[PDB]
Amino acid sequence: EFNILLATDSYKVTHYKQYPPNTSKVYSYFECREKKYEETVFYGLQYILNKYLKGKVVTKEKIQEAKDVYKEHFQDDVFNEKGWNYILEKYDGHLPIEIKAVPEGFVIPRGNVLFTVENTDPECYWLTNWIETILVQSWYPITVATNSREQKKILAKYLLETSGNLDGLEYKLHDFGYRGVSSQETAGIGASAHLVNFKGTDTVAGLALIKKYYGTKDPVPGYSVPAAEHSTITAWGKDHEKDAFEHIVTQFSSVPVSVVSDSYDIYNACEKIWGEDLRHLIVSRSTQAPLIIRPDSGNPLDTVLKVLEILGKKFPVTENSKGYKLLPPYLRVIQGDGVDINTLQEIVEGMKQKMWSIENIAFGSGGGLLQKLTRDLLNCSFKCSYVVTNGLGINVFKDPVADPNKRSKKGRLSLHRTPAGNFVTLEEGKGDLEEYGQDLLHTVFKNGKVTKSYSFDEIRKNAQLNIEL
Amino acid sequence: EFNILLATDSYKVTHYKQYPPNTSKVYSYFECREKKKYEETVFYGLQYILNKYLKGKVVTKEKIQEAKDVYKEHFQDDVFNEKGWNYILEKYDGHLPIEIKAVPEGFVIPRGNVLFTVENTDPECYWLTNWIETILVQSWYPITVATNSREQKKILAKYLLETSGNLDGLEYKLHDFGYRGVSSQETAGIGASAHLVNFKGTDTVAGLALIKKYYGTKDPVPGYSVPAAEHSTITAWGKDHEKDAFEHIVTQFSSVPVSVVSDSYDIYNACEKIWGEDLRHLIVSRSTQAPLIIRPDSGNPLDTVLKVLEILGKKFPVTENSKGYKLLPPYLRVIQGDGVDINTLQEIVEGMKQKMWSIENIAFGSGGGLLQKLTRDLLNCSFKCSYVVTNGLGINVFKDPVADPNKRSKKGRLSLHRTPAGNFVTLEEGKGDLEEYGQDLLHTVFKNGKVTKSYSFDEIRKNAQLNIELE
Ligand SMILES: Nc1cccc(C(=O)N2CCC(CCCCNC(=O)/C=C/c3cccnc3)CC2)c1
Ligand SMILES: Nc1cccc(C(=O)N2CCC(CCCCNC(=O)/C=C/c3cccnc3)CC2)c1
Numbered sequence: 021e022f023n024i025l026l027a028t029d030s031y032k033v034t035h036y037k038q039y040p041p042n043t044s045k046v047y048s049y050f051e052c053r054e055k056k057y058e059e060t061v062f063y064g065l066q067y068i069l070n071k072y073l074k075g076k077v078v079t080k081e082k083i084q085e086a087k088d089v090y091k092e093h094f095q096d097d098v099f100n101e102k103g104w105n106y107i108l109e110k111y112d113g114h115l116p117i118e119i120k121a122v123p124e125g126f127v128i129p130r131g132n133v134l135f136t137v138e139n140t141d142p143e144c145y146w147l148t149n150w151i152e153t154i155l156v157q158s159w160y161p162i163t164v165a166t167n168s169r170e171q172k173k174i175l176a177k178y179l180l181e182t183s184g185n186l187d188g189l190e191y192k193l194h195d196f197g198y199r200g201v202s203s204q205e206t207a208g209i210g211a212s213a214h215l216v217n218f219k220g221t222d223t224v225a226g227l228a229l230i231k232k233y234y235g236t237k238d239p240v241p242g243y244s245v246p247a248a249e250h251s252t253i254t255a256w257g258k259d260h261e262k263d264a265f266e267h268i269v270t271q272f273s274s275v276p277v278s279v280v281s282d283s284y285d286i287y288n289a290c291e292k293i294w295g296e297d298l299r300h301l302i303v304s305r306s307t308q309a310p311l312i313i314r315p316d317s318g319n320p321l322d323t324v325l326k327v328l329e330i331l332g333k334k335f336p337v338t339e340n341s342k343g344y345k346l347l348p349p350y351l352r353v354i355q356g357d358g359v360d361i362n363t364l365q366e367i368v369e370g371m372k373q374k375m376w377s378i379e380n381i382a383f384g385s386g387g388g389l390l391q392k393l394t395r396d397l398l399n400c401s402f403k404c405s406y407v408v409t410n411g412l413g414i415n416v417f418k419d420p421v422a423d424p425n426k427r428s429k430k431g432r433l434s435l436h437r438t439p440a441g442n443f444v445t446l447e448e449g450k451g452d453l454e455e456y457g458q459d460l461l462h463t464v465f466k467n468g469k470v471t472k473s474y475s476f477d478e479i480r481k482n483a484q485l486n487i488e489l
Numbered sequence: 490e491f492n493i494l495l496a497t498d499s500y501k502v503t504h505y506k507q508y509p510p511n512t513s514k515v516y517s518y519f520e521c522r523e524k525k526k527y528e529e530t531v532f533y534g535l536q537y538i539l540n541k542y543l544k545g546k547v548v549t550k551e552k553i554q555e556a557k558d559v560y561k562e563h564f565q566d567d568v569f570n571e572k573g574w575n576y577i578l579e580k581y582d583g584h585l586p587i588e589i590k591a592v593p594e595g596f597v598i599p600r601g602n603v604l605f606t607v608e609n610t611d612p613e614c615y616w617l618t619n620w621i622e623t624i625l626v627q628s629w630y631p632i633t634v635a636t637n638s639r640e641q642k643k644i645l646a647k648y649l650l651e652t653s654g655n656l657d658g659l660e661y662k663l664h665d666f667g668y669r670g671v672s673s674q675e676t677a678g679i680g681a682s683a684h685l686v687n688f689k690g691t692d693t694v695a696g697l698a699l700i701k702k703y704y705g706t707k708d709p710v711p712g713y714s715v716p717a718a719e720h721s722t723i724t725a726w727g728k729d730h731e732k733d734a735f736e737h738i739v740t741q742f743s744s745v746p747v748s749v750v751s752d753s754y755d756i757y758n759a760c761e762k763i764w765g766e767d768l769r770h771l772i773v774s775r776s777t778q779a780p781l782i783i784r785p786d787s788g789n790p791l792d793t794v795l796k797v798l799e800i801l802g803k804k805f806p807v808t809e810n811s812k813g814y815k816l817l818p819p820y821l822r823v824i825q826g827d828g829v830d831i832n833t834l835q836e837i838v839e840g841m842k843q844k845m846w847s848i849e850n851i852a853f854g855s856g857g858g859l860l861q862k863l864t865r866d867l868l869n870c871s872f873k874c875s876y877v878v879t880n881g882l883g884i885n886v887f888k889d890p891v892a893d894p895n896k897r898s899k900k901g902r903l904s905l906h907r908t909p910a911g912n913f914v915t916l917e918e919g920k921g922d923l924e925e926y927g928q929d930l931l932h933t934v935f936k937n938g939k940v941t942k943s944y945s946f947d948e949i950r951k952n953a954q955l956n957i958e959l960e
Binding site for chain 2: 223
């Protein structure tokens with residue numbers, strides 16, 4: 021079972037002995053520090069509040085387990101047993117913490133307060149930063165959701181330019197990342213974050229997480245279709261690739277079906293197998309049930325362009341109302357190898373230059389989508405900005421000489437709309453002056469309870485692109 | 490609760506309809522594919538997966554029904570192999586009819602070798618082998634963390650031995666700072682445990698419980714830490730009182746090593762004029778067991794380390810060790826734990842060496858670089874079907890994409906062997922059966938729902954030792 025007393029960085033065990041004597045308040049905040057990626061989608065806090073922070077999180081057994089572990093880990097008795105016991109006894113093991121946060125799905129420029137944390141009992145001054153470690157992990161769903169939304173912006177731009185509309189947008193970036201993340205837990209968190217922006221996923225773990233922690237009106241938040249893998253083609257033998265293809269598209273004759281076509285020779289597969297031997301099985305398919313040809317190797321742009329050129333010579337191409345070429349409706353491509361935000365841009369731009377509509381393609385992304393991301397992409401960071409010691413509040417901050425980008429904010433913070441409707445973070449308690457209206461942060465956790473929450477449907481609404489609105 | 494029926498890539502739900510008819514066996518393997526440097530990989534983490542997710546009764550009627558219900562909506566179609574999952578429930582009380590054979594954990598194996606194989610033990614469950622690809626391929630993560638951590642240990646060992654003449658302290662020279670910087674609690678425990686294969690210092694507490702539960706150590710714990718400050722504990726004093734914070738902290742922890750982040754405002758002033766003058770008397774009186782460890786945390790990591798050492802060498806008595814390298818007094822050391830990854834680590838120790846500073850002077854912390862800034866394509870960790878039985882005939886299967894020979898997979902039944910010169914070879918096409926190469930190094934570790942062979946964390950560490958530590 022999870023034990024919050026064992027879910028912090030080791031050094032934080034020792035911090036209660038380091039703050040100024042008679043400190044009754046430690047007040048901290050989270051931002052995606054300013055330094056590409058100008059605005060971040062705030063998502064994932066609610067998962068952490070519910071799974072890890074709410075309710076009775078301290079027990080006698082957890083305190084004893086922690087004590088025993090830390091005694092050996094530090095080769096010394098430095099653990100605040102009394103401090104944890106106080107929480108157990110006074111609050112029935114509910115954390116005396118208040119968290120205020122911007123609504124989930126909100127899209128906020130860099131360098132703004134996203135949430136704040138403070139203790140609600142003077143005895144628990146040390147608890148605010150105990151829980152930095154677990155809260156800072158919100159970087160991950162924030163960053164996944166942000167980077168996925170940034171890819172959506174690219175796809176929207178190019179789809180609108182090449183087709184005149186956004187039809188199909190929220191299926192154009194499919195999550196392939198389940199195997200390529202670091203754990204089952206990560207898989208669910210990251211896949212949920214991608215689903216803020218798109219509807220297509222193979223990372224099944226995302227569905228249960230959303231259902232449990234956020235909720236949707238629809239039975240599920242994301243969808244998939246049948247598709248082949250190398251094992252299901254290659255198992256037939258090298259000389260029987262055509263047989264595998266015929267079997268699979270016949271098994272799935274009335275739903276869209278993706279078929280990995282590069283086991284031996286993508287270009288032969290497209291030109292000869294699909295384009296000649298099995299063409300009669302493709303041209304007969306419903307518009308609601310296309311064959312989706314999947315290359316999976318080689319230079320992504322060059323491979324997509326060559327696959328399209330092949331198919332456009334074997335199948336009847338049309339020219340849409342914008343002047344771009346369009347495969348027949350029973351035939352599409354999915355490129356799901358080497359896709360990240362940079363190659364995504366390269367591919368759609370190269371397709372546009374060769375007069376191929378983005379309607380012809382969808383993308384899959386695995387590691388690029390869910391794994392090839394770090395906390396330093398958006399500089400997601402938690403810092404103390406205010407303390408009260410001997411009854412006096414002081415504004416506190418770091419400001420390292422050699423790196424002004426690491427300067428932190430001072431004092432009590434609030435988030436506001438400017439007169440032009442942008443965001444601003446007021447420091448030093450200046451929000452109290454009421455020159456910029458009401459604080460946009462809401463209390464979402466207090467004293468062991470989640471006090472405000474968002475459905476997944478609301479999060480999605482909040483995270484929509486302008487071009488969509 | 491975890492449901493293995495919902496723990497696969499969605500498309501794999503449809504694959505039972507795609508394999509050739511009359512297929513009784515699907516046999517697949519995992520490797521860290523070679524790429525025409527990370528030449529060798531530490532095999533670690535499978536045992537976690539086997540125990541946590543794969544062993545015992547993993548199928549129930551309720552799990553079947555919930556998968557069925559989710560998949561109907563997710564696919565907008567009924568494609569789920571309810572019959573096949575029910576078969577396992579009724580026939581094997583929900584235990585997976587799968588055999589997995591693996592190289593022992595901690596083993597260090599060159600790229601492009603079989604590390605483990607998976608096959609179904611019941612013909613009806615031909616589809617189950619690749620169902621569990623997704624969950625098993627996540628072993629990429631502990632392998633990669635353990636590998637990348639070991640490659641960093643190789644760099645540290647080289648420069649420590651050069652600058653000092655020995656490896657003392659090596660075991661503590663790369664500390665895990667990564668708990669906040671990973672994507673989840675579960676990742677934290679897995680990655681931290683992988684780093685501890687190579688080192689003994691960690692602040693990622695999650696790693697300890699994982700090792701205790703799934704591997705085990707003769708010692709009470711596998712990893713250790715010391716007291717240390719963060720910006721909050723310094724800055725909470727007010728800037729004008731940074732010296733008061735330092736004094737308070739080193740006096741609180743006067744008898745153990747203590748790390749004190751020193752860059753809140755001006756790292757150079759803190760070193761030269763706070764530690765180097767105002768509080769010097771509290772540092773020179775410390776035990777060799779209980780040094781002050783000054784922690785910069787900003788600026789160019791090499792430049793900052795070199796400037797910090799230059800300042801400290803002017804304020805504190807420096808000696809020259811027997812190799813000619815400068816050494817701080819024993820009550821004073823440095824920890825650099827900003828911007829550290831395998832590339833910057835190398836830069837910093839080389840820069841130190843060029844300026845005649847012993848690596849004895851320094852330890853490193855690494856967070857995102859150690860545990861998060863890694864992907865499955867670093868070592869090309871990959872799982873592929875290499876053998877099937879169809880109509881009772883075994884056939885060697887493989888991929889070989891025309892545009893990428895690096896993605897060619899191995900053929901047939903595989904086995905891993907020592908070569909006559911003591912290297913490793915993977916034999917393909919069942920050639921291991923010829924017995925020209927001594928015993929297969931793959932052992933059965935899972936069979937029909939049971940974990941059949943386990944390794945302690947101690948054994949894993951032994952297996953993963955560096956040669957230089959052997960020598
Ligand atoms: N306009 C346009 C253009 C392209 C297509 C379409 C269209 O019909 N759809 C949009 C795409 C949507 C999903 C397709 C997933 C296919 N699945 C795979 O390829 C699975 C691979 C995989 C690989 C590795 C790991 N896990 C899974 C089906 C509907 C429309
Ligand atoms: N030769 C030599 C050279 C350098 C030192 C030493 C020496 O005494 N040791 C080696 C190092 C070992 C551990 C020190 C960790 C200190 N912890 C921190 O700085 C924690 C920071 C942090 C930051 C972010 C997230 N989590 C934690 C103490 C023993 C010997």
